[PDB]
């Protein structure tokens, strides 16, 4: 047999872990991304691209370190090591945030390899590849927020930096500038993620309490681990309970386990649409009726106008050192204050 | 013409109507706030 | 406040068109049994 087939069979051998063709893209890209983050939160600075400190070497604890995005003066640069901005010099390349693009691109390729790994395993076992389809929700999220959005703004500077507090900063920046909570697609996302956790808890509890042979000296033994369950309980019991409490229940197990797949996945997809909308700075910030009524009448207050005042504050007090490359300097008689209202 | 041999019917049972109508009317309540502005 | 004359038409169509679509399929498949 030809050399291709020998090679192909050896990639598909029975091992502790399957390598497969998808492994060839998966393992280097994933390992190098993961190591890149590990050496960055441990040695690499951010002192020349944000004026912040985020390294164990600089002295910081687990929550305040990050591998940080490049400057705004780099534009949409790919930041290659051999490219014409670091020109083959390692120290400059770590200092200029080139390690950020390293992680982002290698992690995208790791995600591609992983969905391909799910297909490959599904096809050699011969099951339907539904778990790969489920894994398109993370990919949607990832390519919309770490790649598509910064490619719409002005640089990679507004891309979300890899880090704990660095992502906590993303939340306030979105809350203040775009008013993300008022966007309907994010509303649909919050409902979907909470709905997924809701089905998780309810399923987990009501299968646990309706088992066949919870006493009786259970005389069933197999297991048959791939079934996961879904014969170790009586469906009829479950239905008959829920159909009395909430007044509706499932009666078909297949559609239950498809609804569980459907809900949190659709959630993330709607939010992924929402944030690719923000990339063009197409946001819903306000309702036009409330603004005209509030301009015509200032004895009008709602919880929504209130949100507008708070957002107005977030921006002006965070921006002068969140965005230091803009060189905002704001006197303390122009910064917003509640007691001036 | 002569009948198509690939003619199959289309189904929709009651519980799908309930679910589907719920989704339509609920989606309207969410986006109507933004249509009226 | 200015409320759109066309916001109402969007609302109206958004509900009425899909609802009558699903309903017609349902009554069609009910006459398929009887």
């Amino acid at each position: 047999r030809g050399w291709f087939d020998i090679l192909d069979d050896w990639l598909k051998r029975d091992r502790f872990v399957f390598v497969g063709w998808s492994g060839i893209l998966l393992f280097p890209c994933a390992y190098l991304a993961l190591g890149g983050w590990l050496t960055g939160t441990t040695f690499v600075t951010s002192w020349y691209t944000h004026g912040l400190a985020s390294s164990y070497l600089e002295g910081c604890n687990f929550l305040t370190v990050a591998v940080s995005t490049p400057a705004n003066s780099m534009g949409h640069s790919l930041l290659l090591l051999w490219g014409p901005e670091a020109q083959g010099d390692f120290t400059r390349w770590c200092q200029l945030g080139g390690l950020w693009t390293f992680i982002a691109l290698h992690g995208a390729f790791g995600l591609i390899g992983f969905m391909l790994r799910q297909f490959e395993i599904a096809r050699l076992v011969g099951v339907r590849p539904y778990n790969a389809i489920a894994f398109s929700a993370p990919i949607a999220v990832f390519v919309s927020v770490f790649l598509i959005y910064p490619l719409g703004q002005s640089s990679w500077f507004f891309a979300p930096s890899f880090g704990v507090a660095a992502i906590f900063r993303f939340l306030l920046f979105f809350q203040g500038f775009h008013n993300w909570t008022l966007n309907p697609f994010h509303m649909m996302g919050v409902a979907g993620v909470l709905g997924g956790a809701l089905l998780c808890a309810i399923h987990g509890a009501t299968v646990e309490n309706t088992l066949f042979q919870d006493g009786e000296g259970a005389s069933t033994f197999r297991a048959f681990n791939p079934t996961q369950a879904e014969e170790t309980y009586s469906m009829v019991t479950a239905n008959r309970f829920w159909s009395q409490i909430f007044g509706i229940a499932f009666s078909n197990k297949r559609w239950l386990h498809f609804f569980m797949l459907f809900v949190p996945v659709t959630g993330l997809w709607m939010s992924a649409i929402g944030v690719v909308g923000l990339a063009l700075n197409l946001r819903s910030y306000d309702f036009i009726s409330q603004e005209i009524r509030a301009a015509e009448d200032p004895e009008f207050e709602t919880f929504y106008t209130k949100n507008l005042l708070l957002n107005e504050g977030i921006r002006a007090w965070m921006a002068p050192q969140d965005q230091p490359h803009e060189n905002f300097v704001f006197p303390e008689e122009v910064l917003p204050r509640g007691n001036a209202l | 013409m002569e009948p198509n041999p690939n003619r199959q019917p289309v189904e929709l049972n009651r519980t799908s109507l309930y679910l589907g109508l719920l989704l339509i009317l609920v989606l309207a309540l969410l986006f109507s706030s933004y249509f009226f502005n | 406040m200015e409320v759109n004359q066309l916001g109402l038409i969007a609302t109206a169509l958004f509900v009425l068109v899909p609802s009558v679509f699903l309903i017609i399929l349902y009554v069609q498949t009910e006459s398929q049994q009887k």
């Binding site: 007044g247 009666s251 | 719920l22 609920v26 309207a28 309540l29 109507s32 | 609302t11 509900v15």
Partner: peptide, 28 residues
């Protein structure tokens, strides 16, 4: 204009609740 539309859509949800409880499809 707007508020009638809001309460009408509400009213038909709660009607749909009633229909789903006391007129479900007999599963046979």
């Amino acid at each position: 204009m707007e508020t009638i539309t809001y309460v009408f859509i509400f009213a038909c949800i709660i009607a749909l609740f009633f229909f789903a409880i006391f007129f479900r499809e007999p599963p046979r």
